[PDB]
Symmetry: C6
Subunit: 216 residues, 6 copies
Amino acid sequence: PIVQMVHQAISPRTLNAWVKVVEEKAFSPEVIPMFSALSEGATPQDLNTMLNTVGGHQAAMQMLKETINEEAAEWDRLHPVHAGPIAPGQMREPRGSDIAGTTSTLQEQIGWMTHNPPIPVGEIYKRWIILGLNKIVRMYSPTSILDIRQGPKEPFRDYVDRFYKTLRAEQASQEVKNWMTETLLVQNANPDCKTILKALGPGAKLEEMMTACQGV
Amino acid sequence: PIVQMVHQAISPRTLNAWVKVVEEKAFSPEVIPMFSALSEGATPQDLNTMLNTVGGHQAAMQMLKETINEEAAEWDRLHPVHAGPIAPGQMREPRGSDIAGTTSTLQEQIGWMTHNPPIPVGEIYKRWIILGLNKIVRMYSPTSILDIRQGPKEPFRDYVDRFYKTLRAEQASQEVKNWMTETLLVQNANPDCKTILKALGPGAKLEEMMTACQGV
Amino acid sequence: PIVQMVHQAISPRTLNAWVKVVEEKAFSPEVIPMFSALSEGATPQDLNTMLNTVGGHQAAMQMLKETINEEAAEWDRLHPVHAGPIAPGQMREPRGSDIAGTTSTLQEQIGWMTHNPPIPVGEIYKRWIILGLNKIVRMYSPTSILDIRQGPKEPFRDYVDRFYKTLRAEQASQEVKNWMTETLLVQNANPDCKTILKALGPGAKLEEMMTACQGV
Amino acid sequence: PIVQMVHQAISPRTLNAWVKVVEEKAFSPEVIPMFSALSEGATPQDLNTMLNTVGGHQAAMQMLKETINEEAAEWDRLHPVHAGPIAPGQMREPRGSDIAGTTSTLQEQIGWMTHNPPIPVGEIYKRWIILGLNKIVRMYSPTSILDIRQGPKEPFRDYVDRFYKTLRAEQASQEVKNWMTETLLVQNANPDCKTILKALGPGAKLEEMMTACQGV
Amino acid sequence: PIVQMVHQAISPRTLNAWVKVVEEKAFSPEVIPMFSALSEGATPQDLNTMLNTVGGHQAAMQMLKETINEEAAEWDRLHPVHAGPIAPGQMREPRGSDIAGTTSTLQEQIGWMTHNPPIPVGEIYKRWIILGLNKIVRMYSPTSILDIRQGPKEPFRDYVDRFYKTLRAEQASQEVKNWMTETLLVQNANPDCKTILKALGPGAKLEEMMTACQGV
Amino acid sequence: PIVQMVHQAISPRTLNAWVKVVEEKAFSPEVIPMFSALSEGATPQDLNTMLNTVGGHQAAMQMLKETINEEAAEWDRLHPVHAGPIAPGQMREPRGSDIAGTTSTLQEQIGWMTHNPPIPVGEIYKRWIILGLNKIVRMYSPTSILDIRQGPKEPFRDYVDRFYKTLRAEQASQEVKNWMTETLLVQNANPDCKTILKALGPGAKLEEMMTACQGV
Ligand SMILES: [Cl-]
Ligand SMILES: [Cl-]
Ligand SMILES: [Cl-]
Ligand SMILES: [Cl-]
Ligand SMILES: [Cl-]
Ligand SMILES: [Cl-]
Ligand SMILES: [Cl-]
Ligand SMILES: [Cl-]
Ligand SMILES: [Cl-]
Ligand SMILES: [Cl-]
Ligand SMILES: [Cl-]
Ligand SMILES: [Cl-]
């Protein structure tokens, strides 16, 4: 990564942490914040290191390559590289493959990120990767938020855990996820607790709803 | 975080420590000082990293979003952002969502915290999070301090452990918690030790009370 | 803590070490040097972090609050805070609660410790905490040094281990602990080894005493 | 390694990580990105350290020496070292054995990497090693991509895992591996899922193919 | 400790390492180099930290206090502290208790070690501690080098292991330990190997002796 | 060690790593690169620390002292120390015992290594130690390369593993080890694979030989 702006190699324990996350949790949503966390300030090289060091799950990793290539091609469409000799004071325009690290050196990557104005290929490439990771997480979720229904004897606290766990993996904008909260959570509760929450106004927060069905 | 004031990414072992705390202890009161401890000097990004990396407990994490939004809206009410072009020497006013990190970049967050005078969005956001964590801890306590009663054969030392453990999770100002100490601890002791403490003046410290019921 | 004088947050592995010490050893005397060791250069905030992160043992932790308050009130008696506007070049006088960290910010704490002359609230507060920890260790010792008596078949080496272990937890000045060494150790040995040591002059060191009863 | 450009010794936990990788995973493809990751900025000495610290697998390690020697001899052919006294302001031309670290000191290696223009013997030698590691990985793969055939009841997700795992270890340019993707993956699927994918156009991505055979 | 000369607190993992050494190995000779290793550059405070954090083995730790006091009193005899006001440019003369850390502050200890000329109380105190540790190691050795005799079927390699293990814990100058090597090792070998070594000249090295009795 | 050139103490985890290597692997060849790796930039003091912290294996450690003394005496023969007062601008000539660390201080060792021109007692002493370690490794190998013979049903890959493992511990120059490769490996293969390799020209690499006997 790059700290403060002095270059540093990806640490052994960053690597080990990332490797273990995928080993332990496969593609559960929280893997992604962890990914971003362990790659704070990461170069494309550091980002590529993390992806290639994943053993197994190679159907997903292949999917991730495809998504990244789609984003790379789109970058090239909007940002066409121009023909000409790169003058002494400047550095060349990055293509999608330079951003994904496959066709650029670390020094070029260090150059782009540090030059003023900053051209943050690290944060750009990270978005393409995270974009592709969501496609995987969302695909690898077996259940839909529509299927989360409260069991007749399930403590509300546990039903809300399943709902917002499954919700976290859905492909939905904030407004669609907002709609699912205001509609389905109460809609799919079991009759006894469903009634209790209905008596609460139709704009009450989860705290009021959870404490309401705590005894029931 | 930010040390001394040079920016640094949240460390692998900070992350791992925070993850393990929630895995091991759920929402026991001590999780919160640990949270604050592991987030000393944390940016909103670092704070958001920690929250999103929590797997499970998503009913609480949803509650935490709601509390944070309440505090954010309140910030916007008192601090309305003004319309105008941000002059070269200055930086824009932060909204609640900039403080919660959802709508601000790391550089803006670094800018606000370091600019003089300091605008500590990190310490502000941390208070909103801790505010929301208390609501969770307090809700997730099964027992009330009123229900902690000394068993007939329970060593006082163990009864006081249960009392101040349960007390730690109560929603109460210092004065209310002071009242509970001076009233309930002795009130709810078992007859044999209850009598012994009554003979002590009614302003004696826990040391005098614990050593008093040590034999009994 | 503060190193060399640049501020630093309490480290994850300091925290983990302190947490584990209390988990593993409760309040055995050695916990206290460990405490001081892990808090070298600690601010009141860092000191408070360590105390609050202790789960369980809340009867003792409550006792520790009371001791700290006694020391704080005494500080206020000798050092009364004066009324007046704090001039630009100076910083305010710390109260007991500022030293205990409950009513002071980190920057004020950094200010006091670094300003010349140094006002070491960290080392002051640490003494109050250690004072309160001794009250706990000493209270939580089941046995008195007076009760350590050598068994008829106990190797002297093991009897001396029990004596100076139990001695370490006693409330006694160095002179009283010196008296206990010169009186009780030999006094409470078993007849066979007791005689052997009596033949040695009455000012011989533990090395001479231990090697004397090695065969017996 | 060399950071930012200040020399540093290979860390204990780098060493331990590399040792454990070979112990746990033998020569699975991901060992290689890990190798490159743990050797970021590595000198030939640091690279040699990692190779020699491998216990066992000495048939492969011998193969690795042979590959490195082939690359070294080729370096000497294109870059013949010239006879003459090395002038005060300059440093000598590196041979293949200087690049492989066997005949050069750390200071000469530090000199070459830091001198301007940079002569990156570390990154050169690393390529020879990685070249030799691929020969090993590829040789030590038992299966060919041609032999990966979907079982009649195997979930497509698992068949694609085996395909791209085995593909990762193949000796093939990107174009040959591209051909294998577009030809064999669908060709070697089982009849039921093979048909389903055939109905999709013949240019659809893995995401479309995997989601297509998810029910079947 | 003090690095390069900037002060640093004793690290958590130094502490943990030292604690574990005594837990695992009691007072086997190698504990002592470890002690010196973990205390490289240690202040008396850092040295005292390590000693006090030892739980158990308190008969030895008491012995260690006594040895340290003997060395301290001897220091005071040769270096008597003089009466007078310490001038502005100077610092006071250290007593034995200042060197042992019991009566000196860290700053005084930092002052003495860094002032020119250097007054290394750390390295002085460390010698007193190591002096006292040897008395313990040597006392706690059950066996004498005189009692190490080769068993009739013991491989020489194992007999030499026992000899130089037991030798390491003996109270003997280098010349006395040299005499024990040249005399007892061969003297106390078993008849078959004893004869074999006797045929070798009486000045042959352990390598020649060990390889000589390898078959027998 | 010394980094970049600023002095540093040997790290806890270096120590622990070295201790564990000897515990786990005794004197297998790879211990030696590990030794060199963990002692990169090591002073004689740091080198002595590592040797003395080895518990057990004291027959070998004694052998190591003897080898080091032989190399030390040889140093003294070629480099006789001269009589005279060491002038203010200079430092004394190191003897063998100063290089082995037994008769020199850390500062003298820091002085020699840093003074220009550099007098690298660390790298000199390390060679003496490594010299002595090879004598141990080679002695402690039970088998000779001559005795490694392929079993009738042993996969060639496993026979080559045993050959180059055992070869690694042999006392032989590169030319003698080259001869053993070109002669014995094929000579001592089993009849079926021995024939197969004979059909290959008599200058084919291990890759060609291993892939040749892969089916057989
Ligand atoms: Cl994210
Ligand atoms: Cl990629
Ligand atoms: Cl807090
Ligand atoms: Cl949030
Ligand atoms: Cl203490
Ligand atoms: Cl407190
Ligand atoms: Cl690679
Ligand atoms: Cl090599
Ligand atoms: Cl030593
Ligand atoms: Cl002491
Ligand atoms: Cl080596
Ligand atoms: Cl030595």
